[PDB]
C-alpha cells in the first residue's frame, strides 16, 4: 500500500547517498593504488584452496600474527602468454579499491622475480559450487538469499563503472555467517560504455559476448540469470559437453524451466535470460530496481540483507582457524621464484 511506496521511495534516496560516498572512497583508491604491502616470507604456505586457468590460491598463515589468509599466485610469464596483462592489472587495481559487505577483501599484494601475489581474507566456508553440487539444488528461498546479495553487489560495482564478468558458483564463497564473498576479479574492468573482450566462463556468457558484439554491464545481469537458474535447478540453463555447443544454445533464445520452478521465478528468469539486452532486466530505464521490485523478491528485505541481519539458510561447518575441510584437495607444487626478474616492465604498476 501507500506504506510500502513510502518505504521504497525513501530507501532509494538512501542508497543513492550511500553509493555517492562509496564512489568517493573508491575513486581515491582507484587513483592512487596501494602497492608492495607485504612479502612472501612473512607467510607460511599451508595448502592449495583452489586453482584456476590463471593462478593458484593457497591458504597461508601470517608469521608475525598467526592470522590465516588466501593468497592468489600468478606466474607473470604465464599471464603474458595467456594475454592477461591488462586484465591482471585491472584485477588488482580494482580489488584493492572496492569496499562492500559481499566482496572479498584484499589484505596485501606484492610481486617478486616470477610471481604476482594477492593476499585476501580467507573465506573458509568453501565455494558455493561444492555445496550446490553436493546438495543437488537450493530451494528458492535459499537461492534468493544468495541472489539478493549478488544484486546489491552488482548495484555497487556498476555504480562505480565496473563490470564484473565472471559470475559463477566457483567464484562465490560462503563465509562463517553463511553469507557470500565474491572473489576472482580477473575480468573486472572499469569502463563507461561498451567493451569487446571474449572472456568469462562458457555456461555464463551472454549472447553478445559469444557473437563478438560489443557489450556492456548487462552481461552481468544475464549471468545473474544463469546463476539463479543453476542454483534453483541444480544444473545450468544451457549445458553440453563442448563450449561451442553451449554457445549455440545460449544464442538460440530458448530456455526450458524445471516443473518445480515457481511462476515468479520463471518470470524473473525470462527477463534476465533476455537475449535482447534492450529488454533485459537491470538494463532498463529503472535499472536494478526492476529486479529488486520483482515479485520473486517480494519477501526480500534489501536493507536487512545489506546489513547481514537475515538468518542465512545454511552455515558451513568450521572446526577452527586453518580448517580447509570445505575445499577440495589439489595437487601441490613448489612456488618457484627465479633468480632473474621476469616481465618487469609489464607489471611495473602492480
Amino acid at each position: 500500500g501507500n506504506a510500502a511506496a513510502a518505504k521504497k521511495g525513501s530507501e532509494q534516496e538512501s542508497v543513492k547517498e550511500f553509493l555517492a560516498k562509496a564512489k568517493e572512497d573508491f575513486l581515491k583508491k582507484w587513483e592512487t593504488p596501494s602497492q608492495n604491502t607485504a612479502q612472501l616470507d612473512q607467510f607460511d604456505r599451508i595448502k592449495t584452496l583452489g586453482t584456476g586457468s590463471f593462478g593458484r590460491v593457497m591458504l597461508v598463515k601470517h608469521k608475525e600474527s598467526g592470522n590465516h589468509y588466501a593468497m592468489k599466485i600468478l606466474d607473470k610469464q604465464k599471464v603474458v602468454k595467456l594475454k592477461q596483462i591488462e586484465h591482471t592489472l585491472n584485477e588488482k587495481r580494482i580489488l584493492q579499491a572496492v569496499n562492500f559487505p559481499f566482496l572479498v577483501k584484499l589484505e596485501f599484494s606484492f610481486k617478486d622475480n616470477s610471481n604476482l601475489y594477492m593476499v585476501m581474507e580467507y573465506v573458509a566456508g568453501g565455494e558455493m559450487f561444492s555445496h550446490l553440487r553436493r546438495i543437488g539444488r537450493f530451494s528458492e528461498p535459499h537461492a534468493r538469499f544468495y541472489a539478493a546479495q549478488i544484486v546489491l553487489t552488482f548495484e555497487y560495482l556498476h555504480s562505480l563503472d565496473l563490470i564484473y564478468r565472471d559470475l559463477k558458483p566457483e567464484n562465490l564463497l560462503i563465509d562463517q555467517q553463511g553469507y557470500i564473498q565474491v572473489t576472482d576479479f580477473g575480468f573486472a574492468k572499469r569502463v563507461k560504455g561498451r567493451t569487446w573482450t571474449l572472456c568469462g566462463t562458457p555456461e555464463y556468457l551472454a549472447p553478445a559476448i559469444i557473437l563478438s558484439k560489443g557489450y556492456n554491464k548487462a552481461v552481468d545481469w544475464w549471468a545473474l540469470g544463469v546463476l539463479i537458474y543453476e542454483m534453483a535447478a541444480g544444473y545450468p540453463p544451457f549445458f553440453a559437453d563442448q563450449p561451442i555447443q553451449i554457445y549455440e544454445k545460449i544464442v538460440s533464445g530458448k530456455v526450458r524451466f524445471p516443473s518445480h520452478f515457481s511462476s515468479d521465478l520463471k518470470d524473473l528468469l525470462r527477463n534476465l535470460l533476455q537475449v535482447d539486452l534492450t529488454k533485459r532486466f537491470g538494463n532498463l530505464k529503472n535499472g536494478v530496481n526492476d529486479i529488486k521490485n520483482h515479485k520473486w523478491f517480494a519477501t526480500t528485505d534489501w536493507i536487512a540483507i545489506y546489513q547481514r541481519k537475515v538468518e542465512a539458510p545454511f552455515i558451513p561447518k568450521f572446526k577452527g582457524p586453518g580448517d580447509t575441510s570445505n575445499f577440495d584437495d589439489y595437487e601441490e607444487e613448489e612456488i618457484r621464484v627465479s633468480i632473474n626478474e621476469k616481465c618487469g616492465k609489464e607489471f611495473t604498476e602492480f
Partner: peptide
Amino acid sequence: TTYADFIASGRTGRRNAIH
C-alpha cells in the same frame, strides 16, 4: 531427466574461465 543428463555430462566439475 534433464538432471540425469547433466550429471552424465562432461562439465559437472569446477569450470575454469576462458579468454
